[PDB]
């Protein structure tokens, strides 16, 4: 099977960026939910190296492993790669280290003795795993909850270094661990706490706080907490990240909160291990040598500091955190005595916030990322970027990368800033898909084979899979939590979501819209369904007619799904059914008929949702299961119900009668299930599954052309992507499935090569 992205390109948080100190082009990116990527300089493409991972494995007992907490390189051996993997301190029962001798082509996995938090607060902070350069079997790891840990067997086994006192905010921990490449046995570790800079000269046997470090906020900071009226959240600077220049100089970024959102203040310092000198280096502070001149407005909170990368001579670059508006990257050739403000330099005359040109919002080859405009497509300007946590000077070139909550920006030449001019930029997300998708719909006709819904970017009509598309507009969604088309009116779809930016002077429900021209344009439902949460659109179904909409809010309210045959003028609660669910599907052939599977019971409406009747004889018959109805594209009253963890059931009589597919109630364990075009015309439709399909087949993507007698494997052991959480077949192409995942975007899968 050919497996390829449905291109969005990036779309989520880049949490770190690590270069090799000796090997040109050897660069990795970590993401919070989406594993790690290895840069390919030749193909000019980021390569996903962790796609073998399954989150929450259906077999036995797994965790959210896809998220990468930390990347560490062996400075004397470029072939080596170590990853710390695991999303959640709170939610995950274990975490793991990945060790590779071949740049992440292959890994061995070892159980972590401590939990990890790639998707937690302070992930924006700044390298917890580190190889001892003077003894490369030894690695340290700054844990979120249990101090500094040490391995002397290449990250296989681990013991706590009790000799480092850990007062750090529980769950953020020791955010940043660095070895002194020049002085054997010298190392610095940054505890997230007041006076959190710790040093060893003993190779980690003894520790003491670095003498002289700021334990309270500077007068400059205090002056702005007083001018702005808004309080600091800490009594002293809190470390986010630390790094040693080749000049020997130690740089440290501080904030008043761990980040990546929620910071209000911060500072940047340098420290000189040669003479104990501290300098306050913060680029936006009044006083020291920043061009263009800092706004210097003390009325607004400045936010704090995150990123650090060091280069040649006394070159260092740093980035803000939550300065949202002033968010920027700064360049010094100076160890911080003076700076260029890269954000301002690139901001076109007459833009409030630091911005990039919209005409620059494109990959190096010129393909645009229209969605990066959000609600302001055509304005000429996009944000310079937010959550500028991860920044990187290429140690072997003049490139500078910076990550955002959405993309990587890059320049091939940062040195233009030396002559007071803006570097030339482009987006450098080739190969990265970090979206968390919510819904996939493939209508049986029209200009597109796939419409998507997802967190933070809304979703898109995927006209062309090879290239990024614009997100929905008018209305623009932050999320689209529900979406569906009409089976026999494919030009009509409905869209349901969180709308952070309602269109000015447009009447009706901002959280909900329908199209009659395949999403060329949308119009708001005249009124919102009752009980609609602001942060979540719920689930819509569109009757085969295109004339009836069933709208289930995302929370319970003591009613069942609401119906409308007047485009949202009215929403009427049903008889028979008094529960809200995601488990709704419309018939694709007969109008005004909807199927509902909620807490173990099955319901059908033939009157457009006005009234339902409990049916579904043959379905698993006692507990309160969750499950998904899926309707045939070809025949009325033909459907399946996938019961999560238990089985898949097939009806040809509108749900009066359901027949278990083979292995149902034993080896069959579906997570997500879908239908697509049959192999031969008007045979039974082909099935697709992410899950365990039989007793001798592992969790993966499968298809069946004989109603579940035989499941053929579509992916492989290296192509799991965390596991699919969304799935849609395609009614016009046999053997085609779309899988969406939580942090790896959308893969398109096609049976033969």
The order of strands across the largest sheet is 22-26-25-24-23
Enter the CATH topology name of the largest domain: Methylamine Dehydrogenase, Chain H
Strand runs, count: 56
CATH architecture of the largest domain: 7 Propeller
Count of domains: 2
CATH homolog superfamily of the largest domain: YVTN repeat-like/Quinoprotein amine dehydrogenase
Helix proportion: under 10%
Structural class category: mainly beta
Radius of gyration: 27 Å
End-to-end distance, in Å? 6 Å
User: How many helices does DSSP assign?
Assistant: 2
Overall 3D form: globular
Q: CATH top level of the largest domain?
A: Mainly Beta
Specify the biggest β-sheet.
5 strands, mixed
- Beta percentage is 25-35%
Keywords: Carbohydrate metabolism, Glycosidase, Hydrolase, Polysaccharide degradation, Signal
InterPro entries: BNR_rpt (IPR002860), WD40/YVTN_repeat-like_dom_sf (IPR015943), Xyloglucanase_GH74 (IPR052025)
GO biological process, one term: polysaccharide catabolic process
Pfam family, one: BNR_6
